[PDB]
Amino acid sequence: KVFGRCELAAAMKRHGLDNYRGYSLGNWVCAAKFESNFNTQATNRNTDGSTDYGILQINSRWWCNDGRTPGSRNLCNIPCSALLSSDITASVNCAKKIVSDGNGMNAWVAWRNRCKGTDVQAWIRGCRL
Numbered sequence: 001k002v003f004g005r006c007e008l009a010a011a012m013k014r015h016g017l018d019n020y021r022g023y024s025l026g027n028w029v030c031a032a033k034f035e036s037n038f039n040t041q042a043t044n045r046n047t048d049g050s051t052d053y054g055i056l057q058i059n060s061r062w063w064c065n066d067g068r069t070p071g072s073r074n075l076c077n078i079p080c081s082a083l084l085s086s087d088i089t090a091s092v093n094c095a096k097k098i099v100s101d102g103n104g105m106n107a108w109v110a111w112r113n114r115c116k117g118t119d120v121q122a123w124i125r126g127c128r129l
């Protein structure tokens with residue numbers, strides 16, 4: 001599923017991401033834009049052989065099991081495929097664990113490089129929330 005910008009903002013807010021660990025909703029929407037272009041089915045392979053899955057490109061190195069990432073962990077206790085669902089529950093629940101692990105949203109390189117310090121409010125501008 002490819003979410004609309006405000007559609008995704010609403011879904012994230014409902015799932016408790018607005019101001020989760022202090023990160024306003026616009027941060028999450030911005031992260032999602034640059035990670036996946038709002039596409040739940042997005043996948044990308046990392047240089048180390050791990051793979052990123054879903055709207056927030058959660059990595060199989062630590063967070064989900066895909067059966068093909070040697071020496072990796074599955075800290076969200078989910079098959080990586082669950083992160084590709086049209087229902088973003090699994091992605092959000094896992095993102096909550098990731099963002100709580102010490103480095104906040106810096107875990108998402110694209111957030112650090114493209115959203116951090118920017119006017120992220122613009123990402124939820126005009127949305128009925």
Ligand SMILES: [Cl-]
Nearest residue numbers: 001002003004
């Ligand atoms: Cl779609």
Ligand SMILES: [Cl-]
Nearest residue numbers: 004005033038
């Ligand atoms: Cl957009």
Ligand SMILES: [Cl-]
Nearest residue numbers: 010013014129
């Ligand atoms: Cl809502």
Ligand SMILES: [Cl-]
Nearest residue numbers: 024025026121
């Ligand atoms: Cl915001």
Ligand SMILES: [Cl-]
Nearest residue numbers: 049050051068
């Ligand atoms: Cl992989």
Ligand SMILES: [Cl-]
Nearest residue numbers: 054055056057
């Ligand atoms: Cl994801």
Ligand SMILES: [Cl-]
Nearest residue numbers: 046048050061
């Ligand atoms: Cl990696």
Ligand SMILES: [Cl-]
Nearest residue numbers: 067068069070
């Ligand atoms: Cl594995």
Ligand SMILES: [Cl-]
Nearest residue numbers: 072073074075
């Ligand atoms: Cl594990």
Ligand SMILES: [Cl-]
Nearest residue numbers: 065078079080
């Ligand atoms: Cl599994």
Ligand SMILES: [Cl-]
Nearest residue numbers: 011086087088
């Ligand atoms: Cl959803």
Ligand SMILES: [Cl-]
Nearest residue numbers: 021103104105
């Ligand atoms: Cl933080």
Ligand SMILES: [Cl-]
Nearest residue numbers: 059062098107
């Ligand atoms: Cl990570």
Ligand SMILES: [Cl-]
Nearest residue numbers: 116117118120
């Ligand atoms: Cl900011």
Ligand code: NA
Nearest residue numbers: 002003037038
């Ligand atoms: Na899009």
Ligand code: NA
Nearest residue numbers: 065066067068
């Ligand atoms: Na497996």
